[PDB]
Structure 1
Amino acid sequence: GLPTTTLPGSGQFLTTDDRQSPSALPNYEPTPRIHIPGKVHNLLEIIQVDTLIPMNNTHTKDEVNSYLIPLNANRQNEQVFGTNLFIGDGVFKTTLLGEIVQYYTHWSGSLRFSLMYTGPALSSAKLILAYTPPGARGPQDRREAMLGTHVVWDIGLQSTIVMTIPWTSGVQFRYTDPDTYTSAGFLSCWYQTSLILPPETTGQVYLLSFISACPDFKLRLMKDTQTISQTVALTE
């Protein structure tokens, strides 16, 4: 008989501990694995695939239309859309990125925001996208917007433009749930010159917008998502 002493914590059950256990089914042989395409190893692998952002959130019931950012022909100087960058809330929240970020407490890294244009091929347009780093207000006019991170996008044969929100930060991690100290800025978009439709054409054209994370990205300290809850256990 070897002398032992038990410490504080004996008998506790910590849902996060990782130890060995007896197998209830001694000697059982599991089914062989066969090959299946698509294996995922890290959630970091999947948040780099871009998905659509319901940017046009202004509706009243969920609709395919809140994915469409409208553009008006012949407007000059004006603003196309605006949003803050609380990736865990608001427009971002239902996107795959938003949806995964919510399983973690802290995030750090660059984001990739792209816009794909869908107007007739014989039209043309020049837009400016601007990222405003924390510390200033959402820009109120392009002059204000153009003094921060921006890209003049020229609509052409190449249909999409990929803007990166480079990680601009004092503190090396931000909270995924919106927090002030930790806030990330604003994203706005304005006409640089203006949309022009060809003859025989009319109305609004739309941009689709996507979001995905750069390879830069870090997420840490897992927790429970506000995105799902329940009141009684389900049954069959």
Structure 2
Amino acid sequence: GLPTTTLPGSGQFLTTDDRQSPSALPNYEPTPRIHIPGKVHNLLEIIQVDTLIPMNNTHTKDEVNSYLIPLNANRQNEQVFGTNLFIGDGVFKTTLLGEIVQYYTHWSGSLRFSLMYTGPALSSAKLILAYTPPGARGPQDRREAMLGTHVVWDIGLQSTIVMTIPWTSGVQFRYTDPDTYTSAGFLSCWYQTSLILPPETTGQVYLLSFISACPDFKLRLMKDTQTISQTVALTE
């Protein structure tokens, strides 16, 4: 008989501990694995695939239309859309990125925001996208917007433009859940010159917008998502 002493914590059950256990089914042989395409190893692998952002959130019931950012022909100087960058809330929240970020407490890294244009091929347009780093207000006019991170996008044969929100930060991690101290800025978009439709054409054209994370990205300290809950256990 070897002398032992038990410490504080004996008998506790910590849902996060990782130890060995007896197998209830001694000697059982599991089914062989066969090959299946698509294996995922890290959630970091999947948040780099871009998905659509319901940017046009202004509706009243969920609709395919809140994915469409409208553009008006012949407007000059004006603003196309605006949003803050709380990736865990608001427009971002239902996107795959938003949806995964919510399983973690802290995030750090660059984001990739792209816009794909869908107007007739014989039209043309020049837009400016601007990222405003924390510390200033959402820009109120392009002059204000153009003094921060921006890209003049020229609509052409190449249909999409990929803007990166480079990680601009004092503190090396921000909370996913809306924190002030930890806030990331604003994203706005304005006409640089203006949309022009060809003859025989009319109305609004739309941009689709996507979001995905750069390879830069870090997420840490897992927790429970506000995105799902329940009141009684389900049954069959």
**TM-score after normalising by structure 2:** 1.00
Instruction: Say what the alpha-carbon RMSD is for the aligned residues.
Output: 0.0
Structure 1 equivalent of residue 7 of structure 2: 7
Structure 2 equivalent of residue 220 of structure 1: 220
- Taking the aligned partners of 1:17 and 1:52, their CA distance within structure 2 comes to 37
Cα distance per residue 1:199-231 (max 9 Å; x no partner): 000000000000000000000000000000000
Matched, 1:130 2:134: no
Cα distance per residue 1:63-115 (max 9 Å; x no partner): 00000000000000000000000000000000000000000000000000000
Structure 2 residue ranges without an equivalent (≥5):
none
Structure 2 equivalent of residue 174 of structure 1: 174
- Taking the aligned partners of 1:143 and 1:201, their CA distance within structure 2 comes to 31
- Taking the aligned partners of 1:57 and 1:175, their CA distance within structure 2 comes to 23
- Taking the aligned partners of 1:178 and 1:216, their CA distance within structure 2 comes to 21
The secondary structure found in structure 1 opposite 2:24 is: coil
Structure 1 equivalent of residue 118 of structure 2: 118
Cα drift, residue 56 of structure 1 = 0.0
Cα distance per residue 1:101-135 (max 9 Å; x no partner): 00000000000000000000000000000000000
- Taking the aligned partners of 2:177 and 2:169, their CA distance within structure 1 comes to 17
Cα drift, residue 162 of structure 1 = 0.0
Structure 1 equivalent of residue 75 of structure 2: 75
The secondary structure found in structure 1 opposite 2:14 is: coil
Cα distance per residue 1:171-224 (max 9 Å; x no partner): 000000000000000000000000000000000000000000000000000000
- Taking the aligned partners of 2:11 and 2:125, their CA distance within structure 1 comes to 68
- Taking the aligned partners of 1:207 and 1:41, their CA distance within structure 2 comes to 33
- Taking the aligned partners of 2:173 and 2:179, their CA distance within structure 1 comes to 12
The secondary structure found in structure 1 opposite 2:98 is: helix
The secondary structure found in structure 1 opposite 2:201 is: coil
| Superposition map of 1:86-105 within 5 A | 86-105=86-105
- Taking the aligned partners of 2:25 and 2:46, their CA distance within structure 1 comes to 35
The secondary structure found in structure 1 opposite 2:2 is: coil
- Taking the aligned partners of 1:69 and 1:209, their CA distance within structure 2 comes to 8
Cα distance per residue 1:21-70 (max 9 Å; x no partner): 00000000000000000000000000000000000000000000000000
- Taking the aligned partners of 1:138 and 1:45, their CA distance within structure 2 comes to 32
- Taking the aligned partners of 2:45 and 2:26, their CA distance within structure 1 comes to 36
- Taking the aligned partners of 2:216 and 2:176, their CA distance within structure 1 comes to 16
- Taking the aligned partners of 2:177 and 2:198, their CA distance within structure 1 comes to 45
The secondary structure found in structure 2 opposite 1:32 is: coil
- Taking the aligned partners of 2:85 and 2:139, their CA distance within structure 1 comes to 13
- Taking the aligned partners of 2:220 and 2:163, their CA distance within structure 1 comes to 25
Runs of 4+ in 1 over 3 A off after TM superposition: none
The secondary structure found in structure 2 opposite 1:3 is: strand
Cα drift, residue 153 of structure 1 = 0.0
- Taking the aligned partners of 1:5 and 1:53, their CA distance within structure 2 comes to 57
The secondary structure found in structure 1 opposite 2:106 is: strand
- Taking the aligned partners of 1:214 and 1:105, their CA distance within structure 2 comes to 18
Cα drift, residue 163 of structure 1 = 0.0
**TM-score after normalising by structure 1:** 1.00
